[PDB]
Write a protein that binds this ligand. Structure first.
Ligand code: ADP
Ligand code: MG
Length: 406
């Protein structure tokens, strides 16, 4: 068992080898440990963000505005690209590995004989890191689902659902209603429940009513469009806003969370936040002439958004790797509406699809030995007017980031 002075990699190896399969399903274990360590109140204001797509960029938009307003802010996010330290930002910055090791050591001591999962352990450690930082606002990205996610042990002041879409091949009972019910478990009685999904399943309204949360839906209570763009909640209008480097829907969800939070925020901080907001690997431009873009899209809903974005930036060359338990067929079909040339590569581990599993869905494609090789060939092929897009999984993006030492 590692200690406070152990390298972070030792802590991660420890967590990766945890035998979590037989432990009791649900939040009782992690809740008990959080109580023991007084971790349930990481800041006086808490925002929890669930969704299929858009959690990270919603969180980063909240973060950018609140930081522009001079507040102390922490964000917990998952998964990571290159470094575990990406998962906890304070004042917009990653912490040292040594701070993480010390925090993990406090969690290890506090849990006693209670078993915890990797993500439970990580989430409690993030809460400890936030607590010691004396923050104004903490933003929690839900890891998976909502009702049973480790982040749902904390009572949020505003909760949000960013979108609802399928994000996995077939599964028992796995439909929009089921997906929505589970996410809505992050809602709280007497608190705003912000839904940025325009095609909202009824289950979300049902859970809000069951819990007594105040539901504020996109296209019902608030909406947006579009120099700049515009946002409205009843008679409140924010007009001619800067267009952020995040999907607009998610910036709009962020503004709604901030509006219903009642935090006092200047027009200036909102505009400055919007101009700053971005996240690595979310429509990230790495190079120009040819345009090289990285995007972690891994389901059809995300691919639809990416196609709509590519349309507004000559041939499109896609470097693609995906996980096998994802809807490969639907993701590739959607992307194929805009992609001209396909560069398929395998992903590693047991969950990765082979280049062949991708190519079998593509009328014409080339296959490569790995993502780096595919990407380098695309770059070699590209004319200055071309767009090279690296997509399909956070793993595919991460391979290219590591190759570029970004
Ligand atoms: N509102 C949205 N609609 C469709 N796709 C989205 C939306 N928000 C994000 N995406 C897609 O999902 C990917 C991950 O975005 P992110 O904000 O990190 O979401 P999450 O944290 O839920 O995975 C993006 O690169 C983009 O492909
Ligand atoms: Mg995320």
């Amino acid at each position: 068992t590692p200690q406070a002075t152990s390298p972070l990699a030792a802590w991660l190896c420890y967590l990766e080898h945890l035998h979590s399969q037989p432990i009791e399903l649900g939040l009782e274990r992690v809740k008990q440990v959080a109580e023991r360590l007084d971790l349930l109140k990481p800041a006086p204001k808490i925002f929890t963000v669930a969704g299929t797509n858009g959690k990270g960029t919603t969180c980063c938009t909240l973060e950018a505005i609140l930081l522009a307003a001079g507040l102390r802010v922490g964000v917990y996010s998952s998964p990571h690209l290159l470094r575990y330290t990406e998962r906890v930002r304070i004042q917009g910055q990653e912490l040292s590995e040594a701070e993480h090791s010390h925090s993990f050591a406090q969690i290890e001591a506090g849990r006693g004989d209670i078993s915890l999962t990797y993500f439970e352990f990580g989430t409690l450690s993030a809460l400890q890191l936030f607590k010691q930082a004396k923050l104004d606002v903490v933003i929690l990205e839900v890891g998976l689902g909502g009702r049973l996610d480790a982040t749902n042990i904390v009572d949020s002041d505003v909760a949000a659902i960013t979108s609802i879409a399928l994000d996995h091949t077939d599964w028992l009972g796995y439909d929009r209603e089921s997906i929505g019910r589970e996410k809505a478990g992050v809602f709280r009685g007497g608190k705003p429940a912000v839904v940025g999904e325009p095609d909202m399943p009824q289950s979300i309204a049902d859970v809000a009513a069951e819990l007594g949360a105040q539901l504020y839906r996109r296209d019902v209570a608030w909406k947006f469009s579009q120099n700049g763009w515009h946002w409205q909640c009843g008679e409140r209008q924010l007009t001619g806003l800067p267009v952020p480097n995040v999907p607009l829907a998610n910036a709009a969800t962020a503004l709604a969370v901030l509006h219903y939070s009642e935090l006092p925020l200047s027009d200036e901080a909102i505009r400055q936040g919007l101009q700053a907001a971005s996240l690595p690997g979310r429509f990230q431009v790495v190079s120009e002439q040819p345009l090289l873009i990285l995007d972690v899209a891994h389901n059809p809903h995300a691919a639809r958004y990416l196609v709509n974005r590519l349309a507004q930036v000559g041939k499109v060359r896609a470097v693609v790797g995906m996980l096998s338990d994802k809807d490969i067929a639907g993701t590739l079909a959607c992307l194929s509406e805009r992609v001209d040339e396909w560069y398929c590569a395998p992903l590693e581990g047991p969950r990765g699809a082979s280049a062949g599993q991708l190519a079998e869905h593509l009328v014409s494609a080339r296959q490569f030995s790995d993502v780096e090789t595919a990407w380098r060939q695309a770059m070699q092929d590209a004319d200055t007017q071309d767009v090279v897009i690296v997509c399909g999984s956070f793993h595919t993006v991460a391979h290219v980031m590591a190759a570029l030492h970004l």
